[PDB]
Amino acid sequence: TRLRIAIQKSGRLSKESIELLSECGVKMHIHEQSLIAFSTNLPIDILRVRDDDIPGLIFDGVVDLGIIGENVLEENELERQSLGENPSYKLLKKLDFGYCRLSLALPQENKFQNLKDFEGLRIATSYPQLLKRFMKENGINYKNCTLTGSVEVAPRANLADAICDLVSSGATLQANNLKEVKVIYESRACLIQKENALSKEKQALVDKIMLRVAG
Amino acid sequence: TRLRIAIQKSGRLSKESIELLSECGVKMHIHEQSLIAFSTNLPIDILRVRDDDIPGLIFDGVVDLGIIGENVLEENELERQSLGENPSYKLLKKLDFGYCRLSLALPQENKFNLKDFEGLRIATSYPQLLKRFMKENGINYKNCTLTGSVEVAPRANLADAICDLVSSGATLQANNLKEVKVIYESRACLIQKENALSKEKQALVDKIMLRVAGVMQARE
Ligand SMILES: [Cl-]
Ligand SMILES: [Zn+2]
Ligand SMILES: [Zn+2]
């Protein structure tokens, strides 16, 4: 009977997802719960999960609502489509946090003229589907390297020539002596809902939060 | 032109992987907790990554060798094949560590046959392995993919059952669950990328492989 809302357990979106929910009247205590936190004033459960699992939890109808970045959402949507599946979700609201971009970057010392310079390069990324689609759209051939973390270290480790990296301030690129060369995707946080109809009580509650989110 | 070997950075296989390399005569220094480390006596780069990335690095030819659990290798192979790709690798050796089992498990209070899983929501980090098993056995189910905290999903009423990886030497009694069916038995493996190596690198792999065999016999 309780609404299930998935949010990122720790990372970019965590703090502001919890802040948003509170401002919408959802009271809860976030301590170190491994998976679930229970709202103390409303019939709502907060599932604290790895960001990468949120799109799938929505697609699979496991949870009702989720707060997730467009990049993670689209990466996983593309993965599921490529498996021949039909992932679907309701977009409820584009949010005012989670701002970041996914960009091609090169070692500082490289002379870069064009996207054509990425031809035949090995490119390290945590977003292989998003990278793949961009490169196909622009007719550039390359070799993939999928790494879930430490992407920016790939060139120094001689694993890749270049990277496709999620960037906000430029600080981590600077630290790894890399330079942003081409933005391929721009992302923000979004609130989404599972496709299948909620029970009457649950949808009413969703409608109530959506009022205050708009608020 | 240096041999690249990918191993788990930290987790179920990390210690045992670096130990196997030492046992085989590969000396190395680890100066920091970062992606790359190097052998001191041989022309080898040691890449320390998330386990889940190792199959892909091998399929994509990014590295030459990998040490990885069969479960993780098979999950990602199935994933890549289901994407329309043709993941390929050489299996060099099944190793003497990383023993673990992917098991359907239920809450201890539940009355458990496999058709008892029919229609249940099943949480897992290995959705392809689960899907394949359930299709082979004609049991319909609802998927729940979680990268972590799988064992908490039923107590959180997020799922009815789990398909969980359990280590040799460990049980689920503490988490209040019962293993019902092992669907996959796994150990650590040494694998190689598909495209031929240079003669020099292949020669070093051969030398390592002889040593691995001697090490495993001497450890029994
Ligand atoms: Cl040194
Ligand atoms: Zn409290
Ligand atoms: Zn040293």
UniProtKB/Swiss-Prot annotation, chain A:
It is found in: Cytoplasm. Feedback inhibited by histidine. It catalyses: 1-(5-phospho-beta-D-ribosyl)-ATP + diphosphate = 5-phospho-alpha-D-ribose 1-diphosphate + ATP. Its EC number is 2.4.2.17. GO terms for cellular component: cytoplasm. Its cofactor is Mg(2+). GO terms for molecular function: ATP binding; ATP phosphoribosyltransferase activity; magnesium ion binding. Keywords: Amino-acid biosynthesis, ATP-binding, Cytoplasm, Glycosyltransferase, Histidine biosynthesis, Magnesium, Metal-binding, Nucleotide-binding, Transferase. It is an enzyme of class 2 (transferase). GO terms for biological process: L-histidine biosynthetic process. Its main location: cytoplasm. Pathway: Amino-acid biosynthesis; L-histidine biosynthesis; L-histidine from 5-phospho-alpha-D-ribose 1-diphosphate: step 1/9. Signal peptide: none annotated. Catalyzes the condensation of ATP and 5-phosphoribose 1-diphosphate to form N'-(5'-phosphoribosyl)-ATP (PR-ATP). Has a crucial role in the pathway because the rate of histidine biosynthesis seems to be controlled primarily by regulation of HisG enzymatic activity. Belongs to the ATP phosphoribosyltransferase family. Long subfamily. This is ATP phosphoribosyltransferase. It comes from Campylobacter jejuni (strain RM1221). The gene is hisG. The chain holds residues 5 to 219 of 299 of the full protein.
